[PDB]
Write an enzyme that holds these catalytic residues in place. Structure first.
Site, mmCIF file in Angstrom:
data_model
loop_
_atom_site.group_PDB
_atom_site.id
_atom_site.type_symbol
_atom_site.label_atom_id
_atom_site.label_comp_id
_atom_site.label_asym_id
_atom_site.label_seq_id
_atom_site.Cartn_x
_atom_site.Cartn_y
_atom_site.Cartn_z
ATOM 1 N N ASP A 286 0.738 -1.268 -0.105
ATOM 2 C CA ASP A 286 0.150 0.074 -0.022
ATOM 3 C C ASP A 286 0.810 1.215 0.029
ATOM 4 O O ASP A 286 1.999 1.317 0.050
ATOM 5 C CB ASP A 286 -0.971 -0.057 1.203
ATOM 6 C CG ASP A 286 -0.314 -0.183 2.514
ATOM 7 O OD1 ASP A 286 -0.404 -1.455 2.918
ATOM 8 O OD2 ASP A 286 0.005 0.637 2.874
HETATM 9 P P1 LIG Z 1 -2.610 4.334 0.422
HETATM 10 O O1 LIG Z 1 -3.704 4.174 -0.147
HETATM 11 O O2 LIG Z 1 -2.156 3.420 1.545
HETATM 12 O O3 LIG Z 1 -2.415 5.824 1.045
HETATM 13 C C1 LIG Z 1 -3.508 6.824 0.648
HETATM 14 C C2 LIG Z 1 -3.163 8.295 1.280
HETATM 15 C C3 LIG Z 1 -3.224 8.096 2.904
HETATM 16 C C4 LIG Z 1 -1.687 8.505 0.867
HETATM 17 C C5 LIG Z 1 -4.013 9.509 0.763
HETATM 18 O O4 LIG Z 1 -3.306 10.646 0.874
HETATM 19 C C6 LIG Z 1 -5.451 9.244 1.377
HETATM 20 O O5 LIG Z 1 -6.182 8.289 0.880
HETATM 21 N N1 LIG Z 1 -5.751 10.365 2.351
HETATM 22 C C7 LIG Z 1 -6.196 11.370 1.992
HETATM 23 C C8 LIG Z 1 -5.223 12.714 2.553
HETATM 24 C C9 LIG Z 1 -5.367 12.668 3.961
HETATM 25 O O6 LIG Z 1 -6.412 13.220 4.562
HETATM 26 N N2 LIG Z 1 -4.369 12.365 4.600
HETATM 27 C C10 LIG Z 1 -4.616 11.923 6.246
HETATM 28 C C11 LIG Z 1 -3.389 11.309 6.726
HETATM 29 S S1 LIG Z 1 -2.181 12.459 6.873
HETATM 30 C C12 LIG Z 1 -2.985 13.736 8.064
HETATM 31 O O7 LIG Z 1 -3.412 14.960 7.916
HETATM 32 C C13 LIG Z 1 -2.816 13.176 9.580
HETATM 33 C C14 LIG Z 1 -1.696 12.575 9.799
HETATM 34 C C15 LIG Z 1 -1.786 11.905 11.294
HETATM 35 C C16 LIG Z 1 -0.898 11.232 12.035
HETATM 36 C C17 LIG Z 1 0.548 12.311 12.280
HETATM 37 C C18 LIG Z 1 0.334 13.121 13.169
HETATM 38 C C19 LIG Z 1 1.636 13.805 13.655
HETATM 39 C C20 LIG Z 1 2.563 12.827 14.542
HETATM 40 C C21 LIG Z 1 4.023 13.437 14.902
HETATM 41 C C22 LIG Z 1 4.693 12.729 15.618
HETATM 42 C C23 LIG Z 1 6.185 12.919 15.638
HETATM 43 C C24 LIG Z 1 6.996 12.694 16.814
HETATM 44 C C25 LIG Z 1 6.649 13.030 18.136
#
Ligand SMILES: *P(=O)(O)OCC(C)(C)[C@H](O)C(=O)NCCC(=O)NCCSC(=O)CCCCCCCCCCCCC
Ligand SMILES: CCCCCCCCCCC(CCCCCCCCCC)(CO[C@H]1O[C@@H](CO)[C@H](O[C@@H]2O[C@@H](CO)[C@H](O)[C@@H](O)[C@@H]2O)[C@@H](O)[C@@H]1O)CO[C@H]1O[C@@H](CO)[C@H](O[C@@H]2O[C@@H](CO)[C@H](O)[C@@H](O)[C@@H]2O)[C@@H](O)[C@H]1O
Ligand SMILES: CCCCCCCCCCCCCCCCCC(=O)OC[C@H](COP(=O)([O-])OCC[N+](C)(C)C)OC(=O)CCCCCCCCCCCCCCCCC
Ligand SMILES: CCCCCCCCCCCCCCCCCC(=O)OC[C@H](COP(=O)([O-])OCC[N+](C)(C)C)OC(=O)CCCCCCCCCCCCCCCCC
Ligand SMILES: CCCCCCCCCCCCCCCCCC(=O)OC[C@H](COP(=O)(O)OCCN)OC(=O)CCCCCCCCCCCCCCCCC
Ligand SMILES: CCCCCCCCCCCCCCCCCC(=O)OC[C@H](COP(=O)(O)OCCN)OC(=O)CCCCCCCCCCCCCCCCC
Ligand SMILES: CCCCCCCCCCCCCCCCCC(=O)OC[C@H](COP(=O)(O)OCCN)OC(=O)CCCCCCCCCCCCCCCCC
Ligand SMILES: CCCCCCCCCCCCCCCCCC(=O)OC[C@H](COP(=O)(O)OCCN)OC(=O)CCCCCCCCCCCCCCCCC
Ligand SMILES: CCCCCCCCCCCCCCCCCC(=O)OC[C@H](COP(=O)(O)OCCN)OC(=O)CCCCCCCCCCCCCCCCC
Ligand SMILES: CCCCCCCCCCCCCCCCCC(=O)OC[C@H](COP(=O)(O)OCCN)OC(=O)CCCCCCCCCCCCCCCCC
Lengths: 266, 75, 61, 670, 85, 81, 98, 107
Positions: E41
């Site tokens: 993925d």
């Molecule tokens: P593949 O199909 O597996 O991936 C599809 C992806 C995820 C790439 C697409 O982008 C998708 O379907 N998602 C749409 C975009 C989106 O909404 N992204 C969500 C995930 S990124 C986000 O904004 C959330 C992140 C949360 C986790 C990180 C938080 C910070 C942690 C920091 C810690 C550092 C050390 C202390």
């Protein structure tokens, strides 16, 4: 000076900074010290404020000057402030140090003008610092003499420049301590602009990507005018007696003052 | 371009233009509140301050052969 | 107040431990096995201590 | 022989540097190492002649600067301090030349590197053998120039350019204060040879002693990297590793300490400078010890541990204890160079990685490196009966042994510094050797375990130890780190020891504390460092490899995060220095060039005159219409004006005002 | 002299074999694909790219990372970069 | 591996991986020159050094074998009784 | 856009965690937690909230940034970077008189 | 003038004409170009100046707290000052110089 010393041909620049700047210094020993002693002593604080201001202002602007020949020209201004303060010190060591610095400036500014107005300029056709970097890689002989000259400009010991700066600065300090302390800051700032300019040209990365052709190193001509100038500053930096011994007696005649138990002998 | 033939240099027009602005900047100086204040500070205030301090401490001190039981002050 | 993202700082530390199952477990397993076990790593933490102890005991008689 | 010590390292340097093409790589190494080793033997012989038989040797060759009252010679004095300083400087330089033969074997510029190594040795020797302040200043700048060249040795790297400027300029700040202090000595005493200054020191004005003393203290601060002027030394770790061991850990960083000890006959008569030395050393101890625990680079941790030991020397100098300051300087040079060379072994073994976060394992891969690094570390933490034990621990109880509030306070301060020395000492050895491998396969992949099929003859690179030239200096320095302190304490400390009766070090009897340190200090405070050392080592070793989440909990707290960042960012001094000193100077120059020289000075000068006078010239020329009737009226008005001025006996000031007014009008067009 | 083709593939082969998210270790070849041949993925690829950079002790920039969607693409990137150890 | 470099750049310290075929012969001459200068410096030192105390006869003080000041003192002190 | 950025922020999240957590095994548990968070938001599709989700995560990596992140020696900002850089042009200079 | 940005903030991995300076060939330069490139004072971005001032003050405040505790509790001297016959007056340089403790005021 910032115009003429830069726009001049190379031989003109050497004559203008090595000999023509020295006229006002030798002029002080003939026109002020013997015949205007009382005005000279009463006005030394005005001379020293101007000389102190010149040492700081010229140093800071040298640090921000982007024309390589203009940077060597501006450092002449800062060095001449120290010999001017040494010449108004009314002490033996300050007066001898002023002449020593004048002479040492003549060898060093000649060499740095040759390095910039004669070696860099002939090869590139430009005097802007932004186009130079990492010249040591292809021009080791130039970088060796250029570095030694930049240590002379910083008044590094073993150059005649340290002997003149130290003696000039000691006389200025003993005559008026606050003026000498500010003038002493030149030991920090002359190093700053000399080392900064050396690092940006000889060091500071690989060879500049603005150079399309490669550059040849010093020609025999360039080597032997730099070697000769570097020889004079180092030999006189180790044995400055070669000038001081012929200075002591005559320079006594321009000192003004008396000791209480030494004067008016009977 | 200047007497002797020099090496080929990739003369960057932006850097050349910056170099031209620095040579000609004197033609565009104007008196404003900012420039007058800066010019007055550097030319009058700071030099007159060093001049006043040099004046007031001229002859104040001498170190030569000063022992314990003596003062650095002369005045 | 919970963030728009689901990151909780307290839960981040609660998950700061060796996982029960990890998709990369076998790739990183070598970092804790025989040569790098607790015993083997600390076995020679004081290189010559045993030899010195035996020699000192023989000297103290 | 005494001159032959001075010139032999210089001779090798000029052959290595100015005739490298003639001798090549091997010739350069043979000549420099030979010329340094021979000098080292003569130094050992000198230490017996001058120190053990108490025969100082004077040598003057030719005058340097001769003006009325100042006569400075090319002259050298060997006394007990001189030969004491020459022992670490020559031995470590000999072992660093040898070590470099292997360490820089793949560098393309071996001749230049070994020329710099031998030129530094010569400047250091000049600095300690000179018999007057100014000749010492030559070696003072000599080592500074050599330090700048060696930090910038890999000169195509921008960050090493920035570091070399920092070392050159920061030391020049201290050079300016040393110059004024020399000026103050010249002004008061008529010259700067050591004998004159030290013979007249008890009698000179006490305020004069303070001015000179503070001046030479500030110079000492820069060269010995005390809290005010310290920032250059951590940045100096950008040079090749044998440079750090030789120049920035063992010899040149000790020049400031040497300056104060050689000046002890003068600064003993100033309690002000002693008290400032005392607190400045204590601050430097805790300041660097705190910072070093939060460093990620192994050379940066070791650099902050040098800064903390140099503070201990300055602290000791502030207790009028120059012999104990000298003892620690010599002892520290041995085992701290061992740590740097052992670190260089690690950095070579794992392909130049320098970050603790990618070490681990290596305990079975670098057993010799681990052993000597462990031996050196126990000397650094003053583990009982190690070499460092006899110097550091005496400094601590001497601080208590001076039963004063400042002396007690520095004891507590330097004790906390000792706590964090143990912490980052544990941090280095564990994160490099004892922990699990945080680095990749390549470091630990051995040919014994089968991994490849066709690339089996090669392609393993398993992070092994170095060759003979790499490992021989480690073994030698390991031996000094164990026995040298015990073998030599009676010289440097003794109890009524007379090794320095040539007056190399002067201790005024009113400043004696050693009796109270030996007898009046309670046993609890004598063994307190060892109790702390043996426990925080347990605490540190347990927090890792057993706990390992607690420190993480601290890091991910806002309190801990801020604490971690502050100490990792070195009290934010480089941030505040860059913002308000360096950038302040650059902006001052920007204003001067733009608003004054290429600005107001042009307008209230030549350029304004050119603009106005051309305008004035053109407006006056407008009157010249060539109309004969108009010129006739002009003659007539001029006639009447002359008649008025003379007939009415006009005030001349009116005429000048009239002329100025007419120029005013001709300034305005139309 | 420098890195060879045999070394990188073998090192990458053991890397992906140690990832439990690969559908089958027998599907691993020089010209394999992450998306279809191996079944990884979006997140799994970012994790493998991290692994490749860790094993060869190099930093892979984001623009270059997007291009690495195949075992063959990874080998080419590693061979091109002189620094990899 | 080893870095590439221009073969036209002449440097007094050698350049990039410089070792002439005759490096041992050249090293022998320069080492001989170093010995010759050092010996001259040694001769100057052994004549111009100054001491104010002389070593005791039974102590290890090898300079007694070349330094003029001590050699004169030891020779003069041998005239006893 | 909006996909490369999220994948970019995933690598940065894992790198930052390992920067602060030097122990890999402790980091392994951390790493799966962060990944699990990305899966919880995989089904989002609204651009108005998607870019807001990316903005918050960047602020998070600002709040927890390491004072000294790890760099491989040859990477920019690494210790060995630019140590012995070769001369850019290896051609001899053209024949000119100076 | 472009924005007055130090070039250390530019992306190292961008396809630069000049990788060392992170500059493309002809892009416009600021008038402070000389002090905006890689070889120029590094900009440290860990803490804003006000916060940094606060954290430096806390260390000083914590440091001065330790000194106050030490001042309240530091032992008195546990030995009478050592005395010298004649105060070593002649061997310390005579009455013009400083001498040693000799039957003087107690301390
Ligand atoms: P593949 O199909 O597996 O991936 C599809 C992806 C995820 C790439 C697409 O982008 C998708 O379907 N998602 C749409 C975009 C989106 O909404 N992204 C969500 C995930 S990124 C986000 O904004 C959330 C992140 C949360 C986790 C990180 C938080 C910070 C942690 C920091 C810690 C550092 C050390 C202390
Ligand atoms: C790196 C520096 C580190 C720190 C240095 C600290 C040094 C401390 C010494 C400071 C010093 C040396 C300066 C020499 C500089 C030489 C060149 C510079 C260095 C060259 C390398 C400067 O002192 C000068 O300062 C002047 C003003 O600044 C004052 O002059 C005038 O002030 C104003 C009208 O009075 C006008 O407004 C101003 O116009 C005037 O001019 C005078 O105070 C004096 O001339 C001397 O201080 C001296 O002050 C006097 C008064 O106390 C002390 O006498 C005391 O008097 C008894 C009752 O009073 C006390 O019972 C007794 O205790 C003691 O007898 C001295 O003992 C000594 O302390
Ligand atoms: C007295 C005034 C001293 C002012 C001297 C500085 C004058 C400007 C010189 C221009 C520096 C050019 C340069 O490249 O700077 C890089 C250098 C290096 O600074 P840096 O920390 O930014 O270098 C980067 C380091 N790395 C790569 C690891 C991030 O800056 C300087 O060295 C200038 C400081 C000079 C020493 C001043 C010490 C402060 C003294 C405090 C007591 C007063
Ligand atoms: C103070 C003014 C000078 C007085 C002293 C005059 C020199 C006395 C003898 C010094 C020791 C011998 C130096 C050997 C030269 C170093 C190696 C070399 O040849 O460089 C060419 C090298 C050639 O190196 P290379 O051999 O590796 O060739 C390949 C390298 N590139 C890629 C560059 C071609 O040029 C350089 O790389 C560096 C350029 C700067 C040279 C630095 C000057 C060295 C001398 C420092 C003077 C010391 C002053 C002491 C301080 C004053 C005391 C207060
Ligand atoms: C380099 C070392 C050069 C050899 C120096 C020793 C030669 C000699 O003896 O000359 C000494 C000569 C007389 O000595 P003088 O300076 O008058 O005063 C002595 C006070 N100690 O004084 C002199 O004439 C010394 C002249 C020194 C010139 C050094 C030039 C160095 C060039 C490199
Ligand atoms: C008393 C202090 C007691 C501390 C107990 C020992 C903790 C040691 C933890 C440790 O070994 O790791 C050091 C850690 C940073 O090391 P790092 O490699 O980055 O990560 C840990 C790797 N296992 O270090 C850490 O990040 C946390 C370690 C504790 C740091 C807090 C202690 C210093 C707090 C300030 C005290 C000094 C200020 C007061 C004195 C002022 C001067 C008088
Ligand atoms: C111990 C005495 C500390 C008093 C508490 C001062 C304080 O309130 O500092 C709080 C600060 C919080 O950190 P912060 O990044 O603002 O949290 C983000 C939350 N959204 O956290 C900090 O600032 C702690 C400061 C740590 C570094 C200070 C310098 C060393 C201090 C030595 C002790
Ligand atoms: C010395 C100080 C003078 C340096 C220059 C000072 C200065 O401000 O010069 C500027 C001034 C006016 O120049 P401006 O007219 O504004 O420029 C042209 C705009 N289109 O330029 C001028 O016009 C100044 C004119 C001065 C004329 C002096 C004439 C000397 C005769 C003295 C008569 C005494 C009775
Ligand atoms: C030195 C200054 C010399 C110029 C002095 C005259 C400036 C005053 C003035 O504005 O008079 C100008 C006048 C010509 O008349 P104008 O105003 O220029 O109108 C012409 C329209 N076609 O032209 C004249 O008035 C010229 C008058 C000649 C008399 C010169 C007086 C010298 C000063 C005596 C004190
Ligand atoms: C390598 C490591 C070197 C480290 C040096 C550190 C300096 C401080 C170390 C302190 C150790 C002190 C020396 C220990 C041995 C002292 C000694 O007494 O050795 C005996 C030897 C003969 O002395 P002697 O007086 O003639 O005895 C017979 C008297 N009837 O006396 C001697 O003179 C022997 C020593 C020779 C010195 C030259 C060694 C050249 C190497």
């Amino acid at each position: 000076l910032l115009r003429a010393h830069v726009e001049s041909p190379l031989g003109g620049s050497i004559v203008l900074a090595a000999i023509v700047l020295k006229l006002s210094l030798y002029g002080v020993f003939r026109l002020i010290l013997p015949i205007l002693p009382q005005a000279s002593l009463n006005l030394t604080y005005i001379v020293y404020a101007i000389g102190a201001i010149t040492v700081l202002y010229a140093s800071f602007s040298t640090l921000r000057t982007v024309d390589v020949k203009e940077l060597i020209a501006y450092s002449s201004v800062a060095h001449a402030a120290i010999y001017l303060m040494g010449v108004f010190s009314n002490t033996i060591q300050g007066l001898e140090g002023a002449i020593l610095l004048g002479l040492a400036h003549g060898f060093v500014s000649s060499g740095l003008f040759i390095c910039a107005g004669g070696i860099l300029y002939d090869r590139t056709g430009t005097r802007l610092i932004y186009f130079f970097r990492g010249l040591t890689q292809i021009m080791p002989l130039f970088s060796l003499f250029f570095f030694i000259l930049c240590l002379g400009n910083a008044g590094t010991p073993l150059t005649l420049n340290f002997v003149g700066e130290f003696m000039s600065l000691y006389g200025t300090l003993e005559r008026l301590p606050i003026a000498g302390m500010l003038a002493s800051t030149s030991i920090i700032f002359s190093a700053a602009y000399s080392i900064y300019m050396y690092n940006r040209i000889a060091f500071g990365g690989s060879v500049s990507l603005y150079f399309i052709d490669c550059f040849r190193d010093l020609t025999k001509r360039e080597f032997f005018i730099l070697f000769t100038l570097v020889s004079f500053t180092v030999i006189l930096g180790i044995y400055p007696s070669f000038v001081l011994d012929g200075l002591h007696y005559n320079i006594s005649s321009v000192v003004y003052g008396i000791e209480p138990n030494a004067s008016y002998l009977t | 371009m200047a007497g002797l033939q020099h090496y080929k240099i990739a003369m960057d027009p932006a850097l050349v233009r910056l170099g031209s602005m620095i040579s000609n900047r004197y033609k565009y100086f104007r008196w404003t509140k900012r420039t007058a204040l800066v010019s007055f500070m550097y030319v009058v205030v700071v030099p007159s301050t060093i001049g006043y301090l040099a004046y007031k401490t001229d002859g104040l001190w001498d170190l030569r052969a000063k022992r314990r039981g003596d003062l650095i002050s002369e005045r | 107040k919970p963030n728009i993202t689901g990151f909780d700082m307290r839960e981040f530390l609660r998950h700061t431990k060796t996982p029960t199952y990890d998709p990369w477990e076998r790739h990183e397993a070598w970092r804790y096995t025989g040569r790098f076990s607790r015993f083997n790593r600390f076995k020679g933490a004081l290189p010559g201590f045993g030899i010195a102890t035996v020699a000192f005991t023989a000297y103290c008689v | 022989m005494y001159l032959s010590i001075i010139i032999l390292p210089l001779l090798g340097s000029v052959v290595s540097g100015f005739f490298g093409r003639k001798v090549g790589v091997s010739g350069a190494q043979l000549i420099t190492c030979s010329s340094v080793i021979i000098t080292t033997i003569l130094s050992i012989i000198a230490f017996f002649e001058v120190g053990f038989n108490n025969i100082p040797v004077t040598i003057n060759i030719f005058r340097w600067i001769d003006s009325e009252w100042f006569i400075i010679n090319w002259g050298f004095q060997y006394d007990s301090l001189t030969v004491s300083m020459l022992i670490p400087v020559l031995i470590i330089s000999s072992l660093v030349h040898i070590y470099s033969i292997s360490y820089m074997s793949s560098d393309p510029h071996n001749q230049r590197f070994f020329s710099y190594l031998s030129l530094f040795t010569f400047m250091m020797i000049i600095l300690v053998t000179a018999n007057n302040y100014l000749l010492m200043f030559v070696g003072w700048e000599g080592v500074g120039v050599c330090s700048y060249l060696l930090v910038s040795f890999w000169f195509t790297r921008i960050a090493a350019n920035q570091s070399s400027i920092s070392a050159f300029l920061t030391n020049r700040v201290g050079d300016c204060f040393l110059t004024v202090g020399m000026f103050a000595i010249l002004w008061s005493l008529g010259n700067l040879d050591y004998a004159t200054v030290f013979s007249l020191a008890p009698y000179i004005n006490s305020n004069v002693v303070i001015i000179i003393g503070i001046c030479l203290l500030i110079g000492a601060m820069a060269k010995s990297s005390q809290v005010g002027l310290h920032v250059w030394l951590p940045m100096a770790m950008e040079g090749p590793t044998p440079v750090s061991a030789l120049i920035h850990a063992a010899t040149m960083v000790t020049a400031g300490v040497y300056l104060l000890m050689r000046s002890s006959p003068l600064i003993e008569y100033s309690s002000t400078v002693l008290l400032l030395c005392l607190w400045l050393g204590a601050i430097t101890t805790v300041f660097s010890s705190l910072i070093g625990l939060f460093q990620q680079d192994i050379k940066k941790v070791i650099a902050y541990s040098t800064m903390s030991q140099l503070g201990m020397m300055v602290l000791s100098i502030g207790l009028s204890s120059y012999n104990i300051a000298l003892f620690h300087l010599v002892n520290h040079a041995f085992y701290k160079a061992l740590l740097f060379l052992g670190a260089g072994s690690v950095i070579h073994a794992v392909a130049d990685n320098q970050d603790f976060r990618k070490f681990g394992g290596l305990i079975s891969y670098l057993p010799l490196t681990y052993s000597v690094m462990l031996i050196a570390s126990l000397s650094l933490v003053a583990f009982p009966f190690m070499t460092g034990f006899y110097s550091k621990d005496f400094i601590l109880e001497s601080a208590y042994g001076q039963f004063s509030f400042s002396g007690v306070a520095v004891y507590i301060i330097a004790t906390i510094g000792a706590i964090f020395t143990t912490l980052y000492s544990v941090k280095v050895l564990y994160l490099t050797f004892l922990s699990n491998p945080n680095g990749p396969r390549t470091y630990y992949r051995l040919a014994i375990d089968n991994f490849f099929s066709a690339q089996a003859i090669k392609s393993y690179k398993p992070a092994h130890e170095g060759d003979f030239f790499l490992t021989l200096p480690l073994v030698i320095l390991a031996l000094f780190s164990i026995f040298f302190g015990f073998i030599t304490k009676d010289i440097f400390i003794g109890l009524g020891s007379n090794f320095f009766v040539d007056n190399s070090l002067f201790i005024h009897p009113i400043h004696e504390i050693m009796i109270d340190t030996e007898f009046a200090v309670p046993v609890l405070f004598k063994l307190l460092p060892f109790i702390f050392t043996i426990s925080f080592s347990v605490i540190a070793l347990t927090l890792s490899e057993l706990l390992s989440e607690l420190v993480i909990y601290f890091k991910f707290s806002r309190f801990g995060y801020n604490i971690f960042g502050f100490f990792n960012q070195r009290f934010l001094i480089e941030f505040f220095y860059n913002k308000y000193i360096t950038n302040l100077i650059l902006n001052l120059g920007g204003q001067i060039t733009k608003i004054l020289d290429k600005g107001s000075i042009e307008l209230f000068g030549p350029y304004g005159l050119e603009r106005g006078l051309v305008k004035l010239s053109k407006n006056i020329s407008s009157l010249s219409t060539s109309h004969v009737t108009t010129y006739a009226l002009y003659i007539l008005v001029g006639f009447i004006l002359y008649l008025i001025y003379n007939n009415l006996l006009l005030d001349y000031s009116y005429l000048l005002l009239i002329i100025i007014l007419l120029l005013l009008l001709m300034m305005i067009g139309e | 002299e420098g890195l060879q083709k045999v070394e990188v593939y073998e090192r990458i082969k053991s890397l992906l074999a140690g990832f439990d998210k690969v559908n089958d270790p027998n599907n691993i070849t020089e010209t394999a694909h992450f998306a279809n041949d191996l079944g990884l993925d979006s997140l799994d690829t970012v994790e493998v790219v991290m692994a490749i950079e860790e094993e060869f002790s190099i930093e892979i920039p984001d623009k270059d990372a997007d291009q690495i969607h195949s075992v063959d693409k990874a080998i080419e990137y590693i061979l091109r970069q002189p620094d990899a150890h | 591996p080893k870095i590439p470099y221009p073969k036209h750049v002449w440097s007094p310290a050698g350049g990039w991986y410089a070792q002439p075929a005759n490096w041992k012969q050249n090293t022998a001459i320069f080492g001989l020159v170093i010995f010759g200068i050092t010996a001259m410096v040694w001769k100057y030192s052994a004549e111009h050094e100054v001491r104010h105390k002389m070593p005791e006869p039974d102590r290890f003080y090898p300079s007694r074998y070349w330094v003029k000041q001590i050699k004169d003192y030891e020779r003069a002190q041998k005239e006893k009784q | 856009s909006n996909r490369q950025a999220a994948l970019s922020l995933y690598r940065r999240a894992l790198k930052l965690a390992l920067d602060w957590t030097v122990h890999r095994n402790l980091w392994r548990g951390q790493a799966l937690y962060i990944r699990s968070l990305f899966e919880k938001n995989r089904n989002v599709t609204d651009p108005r909230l998607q870019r807001a989700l990316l903005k918050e995560t960047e602020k998070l990596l600002e709040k927890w940034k390491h004072p000294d992140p790890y760099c491989p020696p040859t990477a920019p900002g690494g210790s060995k970077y630019e140590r012995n850089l070769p001369v850019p042009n290896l051609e001899p200079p053209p024949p000119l008189k100076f | 003038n472009p924005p007055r940005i130090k070039r250390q903030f530019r992306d190292p991995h961008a396809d630069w004409w000049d990788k060392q300076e992170r500059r493309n060939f002809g892009e416009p330069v600021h008038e402070d170009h000389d002090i905006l490139g890689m070889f120029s004072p590094y900009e440290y971005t860990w803490i804003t100046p006000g916060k940094g001032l606060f954290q430096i003050g806390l260390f000083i405040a914590s440091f001065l707290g330790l000194c106050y505790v030490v001042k309240l509790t530091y032992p008195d001297r546990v030995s009478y000052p050592r005395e010298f016959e004649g105060g070593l007056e002649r061997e310390l340089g005579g009455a013009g110089a400083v001498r040693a403790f000799l039957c003087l005021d107690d301390e």
